[PDB]
């Protein structure tokens, strides 16, 4: 269902990405962080972690994840922790593996963010 909107609807996919950048910046700008490139800016897990706290109203202690990840391993660990936080929030386990996010798989990234969007639409 998300595959069709990715592979066979560029007319949709672009209102989508416009709106997904709108959505994430709504929340991330509060930390004075801007997202301009959906393809890479969530790969290291940091913004996903920060986003989840913004959407679900908690702080994430800085000893709990790697704020400046220094290896592939730390990024995967950050992403995995982010998926755990999504599950804590009532989302079913994310389809992509954490590595798919770290490797900048755009469909995966956009699925995750879109699955956030469907949930956290009305959140301010």
């Amino acid at each position: 269902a998300f595959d069709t909107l990715f592979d066979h609807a560029p007319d949709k996919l672009n209102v989508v990405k416009k709106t997904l950048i709108t959505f994430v910046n709504k929340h991330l700008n509060k930390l004075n962080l801007e997202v301009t490139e959906l393809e890479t800016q969530f790969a290291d897990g940091v913004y996903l972690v920060l986003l989840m706290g913004l959407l679900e109203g908690y702080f994430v202690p800085l000893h709990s994840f790697f704020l400046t990840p220094d290896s592939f391993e730390q990024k995967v660990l950050n992403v995995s922790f982010a998926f755990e936080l999504m599950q804590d929030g009532g989302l079913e386990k994310p389809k992509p593996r954490p590595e798919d996010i770290v490797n900048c798989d755009l469909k995966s990234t956009l699925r995750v963010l879109y699955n956030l969007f469907t949930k956290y639409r009305n959140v301010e």
Binding site: K30, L31, L50, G53, L54, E56, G57, Y58, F59, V60, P61, L62, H63, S64, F65, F81, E84, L85, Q87, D88
Partner: protein, 267 residues
Amino acid sequence: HSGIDFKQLNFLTKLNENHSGELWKGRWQGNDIVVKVLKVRDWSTRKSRDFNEECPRLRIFSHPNVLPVLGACQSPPAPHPTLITHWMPYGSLYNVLHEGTNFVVDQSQAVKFALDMARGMAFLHTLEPLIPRHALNSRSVMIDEDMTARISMADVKFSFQSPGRMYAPAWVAPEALQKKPEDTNRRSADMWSFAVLLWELVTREVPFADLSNMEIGMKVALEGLRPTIPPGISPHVSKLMKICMNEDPAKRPKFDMIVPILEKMQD
């Protein structure tokens, strides 16, 4: 001790529900109680074991400014891990300061709350080891029928509950936002929380109420965000607040030091 029997609980009315579970008003063995039902993803035997080892420590019956957990329902056989405490009619300090539609507590009462909390914390700081994962804030102090403040043992977090999610960062020491508990002086971190409570009693405002939790922790940890020392308070309340919120954890007083300071402030 096999805990409290869940079937013996008379659930009267539901009071709240959120991320951590639900709270009910109820009755048990001639007690008016609140029942805290904990919601936990991926419950396991190891977690149930940890809950059952962690709860006994909260059953503190020896200090007037400490509100014990009366007991807990083990799960299994209970449907969910559950804590029982006495019902507190005025609710939390937070409810009383910020959500009180009948009367506004006076500053004499505020000083008495501060002294009550300091006495309760001095006592808890004598325990060895310290009760782990206990955060002091205005939601984790209850107000009894005679306006006595009591540190709420039912508000301690368990090892299996959300260690990467802080919901009351405004009260947490800057070092505790960033360092593992084992790498911080926990007693000194609690004194920061008490300093923020002093601020809240002086201003009658929620600290950083205009910011989301994520905003608060990031800004306090990384940008030096701090409560604004209130205009027009006595030199003596000012000095006490400043000393308690020392940036250097090691220079913050102990609770047993501020008790006599607060006793002299009474009347």
